[PDB]
Amino acid sequence: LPPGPLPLPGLGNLLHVDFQNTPYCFDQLRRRFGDVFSLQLAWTPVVVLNGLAAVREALVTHGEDTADRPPVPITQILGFGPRSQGVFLARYGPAWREQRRFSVSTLRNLGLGKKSLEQWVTEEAACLCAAFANHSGRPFRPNGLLDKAVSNVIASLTCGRRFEYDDPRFLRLLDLAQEGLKEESGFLREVLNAVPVLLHIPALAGKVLRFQKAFLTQLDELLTEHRMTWDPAQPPRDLTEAFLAEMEKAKGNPESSFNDENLRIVVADLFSAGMVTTSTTLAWGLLLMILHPDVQRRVQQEIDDVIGQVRRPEMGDQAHMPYTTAVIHEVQRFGDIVPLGVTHMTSRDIEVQGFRIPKGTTLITNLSSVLKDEAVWEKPFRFHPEHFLDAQGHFVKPEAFLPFSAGRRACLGEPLARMELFLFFTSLLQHFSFSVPTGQPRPSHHGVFAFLVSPSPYELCAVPR
Amino acid sequence: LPPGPLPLPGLGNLLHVDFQNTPYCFDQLRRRFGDVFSLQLAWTPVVVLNGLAAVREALVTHGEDTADRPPVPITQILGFGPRSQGVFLARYGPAWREQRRFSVSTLRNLGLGKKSLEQWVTEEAACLCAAFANHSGRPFRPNGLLDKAVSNVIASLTCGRRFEYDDPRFLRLLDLAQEGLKEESGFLREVLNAVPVGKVLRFQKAFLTQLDELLTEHRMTWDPAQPPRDLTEAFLAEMEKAKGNPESSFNDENLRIVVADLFSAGMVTTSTTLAWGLLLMILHPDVQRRVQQEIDDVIGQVRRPEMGDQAHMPYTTAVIHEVQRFGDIVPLGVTHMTSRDIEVQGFRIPKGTTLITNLSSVLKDEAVWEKPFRFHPEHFLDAQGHFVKPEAFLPFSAGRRACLGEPLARMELFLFFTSLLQHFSFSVPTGQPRPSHHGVFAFLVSPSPYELCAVPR
Numbered sequence: 001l002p003p004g005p006l007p008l009p010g011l012g013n014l015l016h017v018d019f020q021n022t023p024y025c026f027d028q029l030r031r032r033f034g035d036v037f038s039l040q041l042a043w044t045p046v047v048v049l050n051g052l053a054a055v056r057e058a059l060v061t062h063g064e065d066t067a068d069r070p071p072v073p074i075t076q077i078l079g080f081g082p083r084s085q086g087v088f089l090a091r092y093g094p095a096w097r098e099q100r101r102f103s104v105s106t107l108r109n110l111g112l113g114k115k116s117l118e119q120w121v122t123e124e125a126a127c128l129c130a131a132f133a134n135h136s137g138r139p140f141r142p143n144g145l146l147d148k149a150v151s152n153v154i155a156s157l158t159c160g161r162r163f164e165y166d167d168p169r170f171l172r173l174l175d176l177a178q179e180g181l182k183e184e185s186g187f188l189r190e191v192l193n194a195v196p197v198l199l200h201i202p203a204l205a206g207k208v209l210r211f212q213k214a215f216l217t218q219l220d221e222l223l224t225e226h227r228m229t230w231d232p233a234q235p236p237r238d239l240t241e242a243f244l245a246e247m248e249k250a251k252g253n254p255e256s257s258f259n260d261e262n263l264r265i266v267v268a269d270l271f272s273a274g275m276v277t278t279s280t281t282l283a284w285g286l287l288l289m290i291l292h293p294d295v296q297r298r299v300q301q302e303i304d305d306v307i308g309q310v311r312r313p314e315m316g317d318q319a320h321m322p323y324t325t326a327v328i329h330e331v332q333r334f335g336d337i338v339p340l341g342v343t344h345m346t347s348r349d350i351e352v353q354g355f356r357i358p359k360g361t362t363l364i365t366n367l368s369s370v371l372k373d374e375a376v377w378e379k380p381f382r383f384h385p386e387h388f389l390d391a392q393g394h395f396v397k398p399e400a401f402l403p404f405s406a407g408r409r410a411c412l413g414e415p416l417a418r419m420e421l422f423l424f425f426t427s428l429l430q431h432f433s434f435s436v437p438t439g440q441p442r443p444s445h446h447g448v449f450a451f452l453v454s455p456s457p458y459e460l461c462a463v464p465r
Numbered sequence: 466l467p468p469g470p471l472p473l474p475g476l477g478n479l480l481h482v483d484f485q486n487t488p489y490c491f492d493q494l495r496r497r498f499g500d501v502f503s504l505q506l507a508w509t510p511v512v513v514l515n516g517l518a519a520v521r522e523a524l525v526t527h528g529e530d531t532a533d534r535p536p537v538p539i540t541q542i543l544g545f546g547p548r549s550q551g552v553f554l555a556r557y558g559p560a561w562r563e564q565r566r567f568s569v570s571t572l573r574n575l576g577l578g579k580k581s582l583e584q585w586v587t588e589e590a591a592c593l594c595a596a597f598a599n600h601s602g603r604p605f606r607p608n609g610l611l612d613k614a615v616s617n618v619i620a621s622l623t624c625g626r627r628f629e630y631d632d633p634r635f636l637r638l639l640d641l642a643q644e645g646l647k648e649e650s651g652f653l654r655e656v657l658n659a660v661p662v663g664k665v666l667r668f669q670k671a672f673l674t675q676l677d678e679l680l681t682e683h684r685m686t687w688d689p690a691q692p693p694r695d696l697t698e699a700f701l702a703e704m705e706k707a708k709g710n711p712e713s714s715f716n717d718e719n720l721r722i723v724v725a726d727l728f729s730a731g732m733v734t735t736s737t738t739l740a741w742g743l744l745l746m747i748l749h750p751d752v753q754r755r756v757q758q759e760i761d762d763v764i765g766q767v768r769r770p771e772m773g774d775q776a777h778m779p780y781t782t783a784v785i786h787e788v789q790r791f792g793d794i795v796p797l798g799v800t801h802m803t804s805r806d807i808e809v810q811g812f813r814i815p816k817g818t819t820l821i822t823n824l825s826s827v828l829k830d831e832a833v834w835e836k837p838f839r840f841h842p843e844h845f846l847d848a849q850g851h852f853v854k855p856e857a858f859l860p861f862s863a864g865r866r867a868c869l870g871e872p873l874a875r876m877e878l879f880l881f882f883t884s885l886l887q888h889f890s891f892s893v894p895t896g897q898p899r900p901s902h903h904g905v906f907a908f909l910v911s912p913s914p915y916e917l918c919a920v921p922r
C-alpha cells in the first residue's frame with residue numbers, strides 16, 4: 001500500500017515520467033510521495049525504492065523474494081529465450097544459478113585474484129600510460145582511451161586476446177557498446193515493453209535496439225571466429241573456451257543452460273559489462289582529480305611512499321594505502337554510475353518501510369538515493385574522500401556503500417572492478433599529474449544520463465612526474 | 466481475489482496483451498503474477514487458469530459452475546442467435562444440451578465405433594497413402610493432403626459423401642476454413658468483441674455460405690423414408706418433427722451452425738495433429754523406427770490397421786498420445802464462463818468471469834511430466850512397458866464441455882497415423898536444414914512449415 005501519481009487511463013503513467021532523464025523525475029516524485037512511492041507504467045505495476053533502509057530491506061532482508069527479474073519482452077529481438085537468458089536479465093531460477101556460478105568461478109579461475117590477471121591489468125595499464133603520454137602537452141578527452149584499456153581486460157578474460165587501440169573491429173565494438181547502452185533507457189523501449197505495438201510493426205521494432213543487435217552480431221563474428229580455433233585438448237584460457245568445454249560436458253541433456261544460444265548472450269553479458277562500467281568510473285576518477293588537484297596530490301604522495309614512482313602497483317598495496325582506497329571508493333559513491341541500478345521483481349508478497357508490495361511488482365532500487373542518503377553521509381553531494389576514513393586515518397567501508405547493490409543479484413564483477421580501478425587509477429596518477437586545460441573553463445561535475453551516467457564531456461592535461 | 470495487472474478506466478487491459486501471439490504474453494504474465502492471474506479486457510473481467518490444479522479445479526471440481534460460455538457478440542454477423550447457437554459456442558442451457566446429446570449420439574450411431582467408420586477411415590487412409598506415394602522421391606508439404614484426408618472423414622459422417630482431392634469446391638472449403646480459423650484470433654476481434662460497434666468475419670462468413678450451398682443440394686438427395694444415412698439427414702428428420710415447436714433447436718438457422726461446428730472442427734484439428742505427428746517422426750526417426758516395428762509385429766506390413774490393434778500396441782499408442790501432449794494444438798483451449806461464484810487455488814472468482822483454461826500449462830505442467838518440453842514418448846509408459854494415460858493429459862480439456870470429438874479423433878489419429886508409418890518411412894529432405902519444432906499460433910497452433918520425404922517399405 002505505497003502512495004502514487006495515479007496515472008491516466010490506457011497508457012497509465014507512461015507519460016507522467018521523463019525517460020530521457022529518469023533519475024530526475026524519480027526524485028521529483030520522491031519529493032511529492034517520498035522514499036517508497038509507486039507508479040503503473042501501462043499494465044506493469046512498479047514500486048521505486050529510495051534511501052538505504054528501503055533498499056536494504058527489499059534486497060537483503062526480503063532478498064529471497066526479490067531476486068527475480070521482471071520479464072523484458074522487447075529482448076525477443078536479441079535472441080533471448082528460456083533456453084538462453086544469460087545472467088544479467090535471467091530470471092531467478094537454475095539457468096541463472098548455473099550461469100552465475102559459472103561466471104564467478106570461471107573468472108576467478110582465469111586468474112582473478114593475484115599474480116595473473118593483476119599483472120595482466122598492469123601490462124594493459126602500461127599500454128594506456130603510453131597512449132596518454134603520446135599526447136604530450138596537448139589537452140584531450142581520456143574517455144575513449146580508458147574505455148579501450150578497460151575493455152582489453154574483459155576481452156582477455158573472455159575472448160582470449162587483447163585488441164590494438166587502432167583495430168577497426170575493436171573500435172566498432174566499443175562504439176556499438178556505447179550506443180546499445182543508450183538504448184537501455186528511453187521512451188521508445190518503455191512503450192514497446194508495454195503496448196505490443198512492436199509485433200509486426202518492423203518500423204518500430206526495428207529502430208529500437210538497432211545497436212544492441214548490431215553489437216551482438218559483431219560478437220557472433222568474434223565467437224565463431226574464436227570457436228573455429230578452439231582445441232579441446234588445451235585447458236581453457238578464456239571464458240568462451242571454458243563455456244564451450246561445458247557445452248561438451250553437458251552434451252547429455254537439452255535441459256542444460258550450456259548451449260549455442262546462451263553462449264553468445266552470457267559472453268555478451270560479461271563482455272559488454274566489463275566494457276562500459278569501470279571505464280566510465282575511471283572517467284569520473286580522472287575528472288574529480290582535475291576538479292580537486294588537492295586530493296590528487298595527497299594520493300600521488302601515498303603512492304610515492306608505499307609504491308614508489310618506479311615499480312608497478314600490486315593489489316597487495318591497497319592494504320597499506322588508506323587514502324588512495326578512500327578516494328577510489330568516494331569516486332564510486334559520488335560517481336554514482338548506476339543510479340536506479342537494475343530492475344528487480346518480487347517473487348512473493350513483501351513489506352518495505354511499512355507498505356506492502358504485491359507479488360509481480362517490478363522493483364527499482366535507486367542506488368543513488370543510497371549512495372547519497374542524507375541520513376548516512378556527512379557531506380552527501382560533495383566530493384568528500386574523508387567519507388571512508390575514521391579518526392586514526394584508516395580506510396573504513398560504510399554499509400550505505402552499495403554501488404554494486406546487494407543480495408543474490410549483486411554485481412558479480414565487483415571483484416574484477418575493484419582490481420581494475422585500483423590498478424589503473426594508481427598506475428595513472430603514479431606516472432602522471434592531470435589538470436584542467438590551462439586556458440579553459442572549470443569542467444562540470446554534472447553527469448549525462450543514459451541508464452549509466454558518465455562525466456559530461458571534458459578535457460584534461462596529462463604531464464609526467 | 467486473484468493477482469494481476471492494474472485495471473485502467475480507459476479501454477481496460479484490452480490494450481496491452483499481444484493477440485497475435487497470446488500463448489506467449491500469458492506465460493510472461495504467469496511469470497509475473499503466477500498460475501492464477503486476471504485481466505480486464507475492456508468491460509469484460511477475465512481469469513486465466515494455469516497448471517493442472519487450477520484447471521481441474523475450475524472445470525472438474527466446480528464444473529457445474531463453469532460449463533457456460535461467455536457471450537461472443539461479434540458472432541451476430543454469422544447468424545448466431547438464441548434460436549441457433551450450435552454447440553461449440555452455445556451457452557449452457559437446453560439448446561446446448563439437445564445439440565450436444567444429438568451430436569455424440571448421432572455420430573456414434575453413424576458407425577462411430579467399430580467395423581463401419583473405422584473402415585471408412587481405412588478406405589480414406591488408402592486414398593491418402595496413394596497421394597503421398599504419387600510424390601515419389603521429391604520431398605513435399607504433407608499439411609494439405611492430411612487436411613483433405615481427415616476432412617473427408619468428417620464430410621462422410623456429416624454431408625454423406627467424400628470429396629475428390631482435386632474438387633475445386635472442396636479445396637475452397639478447406640482454404641476458407643484455415644482462413645476463418647485465423648479470424649478466431651487477433652486484435653481487431655478482441656476489440657469489436659469487447660466493444661460491440663464493418664466487414665470483419667469476411668472469411669468465416671465466406672465459409673458458412675459455401676456450406677449453405679452444400680446444405681441446399683443435400684436436402685434434395687435426402688430420402689426421409691429411410692433411416693438417417695448421416696448427421697445432416699438425421700438433423701432434418703429431427704426438424705420435420707420439431708415443426709410447430711418454437712422450443713426446438715432443430716431449426717433452419719441452427720442446422721447450418723451445428724453442421725458448420727462439426728464440419729469445420731473435424732476439418733482443422735486432427736489434421737493439424739497429424740502434421741505434428743509426421744514432423745516429430747522425421748525429427749525423431751529413432752522413435753519412428755520403433756513404432757514402425759510394433760506395427761510389423763502385431764499388424765504386419767500388409768493388412769490395414771484396426772482399432773482392435775491399439776490394445777496390443779503400447780508404443781504406438783504412447784507416441785500418438787505424446788504427439789498430442791507435445792503437439793499442444795489448443796493452447797488456451799476454448800473460453801468458459803462462471804455460472805456462479807467459485808474459488809480456484811485460493812482466490813475467489815466472481816460470477817460472469819470469463820475463464821481461459823491454458824491447456825498448454827496442463828499438457829506441460831512442470832509438476833507432472835518428467836521431461837515437459839521435450840518429445841518424450843516414455844511419458845505414457847510404466848516400468849513393464851504398458852501404455853498408461855496420466856491425469857494431466859487433457860488435450861481435449863474436461864468437464865461437461867470436453868471435446869465431443871475425442872472419440873472420432875482418437876480413431877482418426879490411430880488409423881491414419883499407423884497406416885501412414887506402416888506403408889511409409891518419412892525423413893527430412895536429403896539436403897535441407899533440420900525442421901523447426903516451434904509452432905505458429907493462430908488460435909490453433911500448427912507445425913511451422915516443413916517438407917518431408919516419403920519412401921515405401
Ligand code: HEM
Nearest residue numbers: 087088273274277278342403404405409410411412413417
Ligand atoms: C564499477 C563497475 C561496476 C558497477 C558500479 C556495477 C554495478 C552493478 C549493479 C548495481 C548491478 C545490479 C545488481 C542488481 O541487480 O541488484 C550489476 C549487475 C551485474 N554486473 Fe556489474 N557493475 C560494474 C562492473 C561489472 C563488470 C566489470 C562486470 C562483468 C565482469 C559486471 C557484471 C555484472 C553482472 C553479470 C551483473 C548481473 C548479476 C545478476 O543478475 O545476477 N559488472 N552491476
Ligand code: HEM
Nearest residue numbers: 552553730731734735738795799861862866868869870874
Ligand atoms: C486434434 C483433435 C482435437 C482437439 C485437440 C480438440 C480439442 C478441443 C478442445 C480443447 C475443446 C474445448 C473444450 C472446452 O469447452 O473447454 C474442444 C471442443 C469441441 N470440439 Fe474438439 N478437438 C479436436 C477434435 C475435434 C473433432 C474431430 C471434432 C468434430 C466432431 C471436434 C468438435 C468439438 C466440439 C463440437 C466442441 C465443443 C463441445 C461443447 O461445447 O460441448 N473436435 N475440442
Ligand SMILES: CC1(C)SCCN(S(=O)(=O)c2ccc(Oc3ccncc3)cc2)[C@H]1C(=O)NO
Nearest residue numbers: 088177180181184212215268269272273277411
Ligand atoms: C549483452 C548485451 C549486449 S544484450 C543488450 C543490452 N546490453 S548493453 O550493452 O546495453 C548493457 C550494458 C551494461 C548494462 O548494465 C550493467 C551490467 C553490468 N554491470 C553494471 C551495469 C546493461 C546493458 C548487453 C547486456 O545485457 N549486458 O548486461
Ligand SMILES: CC1(C)SCCN(S(=O)(=O)c2ccc(Oc3ccncc3)cc2)[C@H]1C(=O)NO
Nearest residue numbers: 553642645646649669672725726729730734795
Ligand atoms: C462454425 C464456424 C464456421 S463459426 C466461425 C469460426 N469457425 S472456424 O472454422 O474458424 C473454427 C474451427 C475450429 C475451432 O476450434 C476447435 C473446434 C473443435 N476442437 C478444437 C478446436 C474454432 C473455430 C467455425 C467454428 O466455430 N467451429 O467450431
Ligand code: NI
Nearest residue numbers: 625694695698
Ligand atoms: Ni445425406
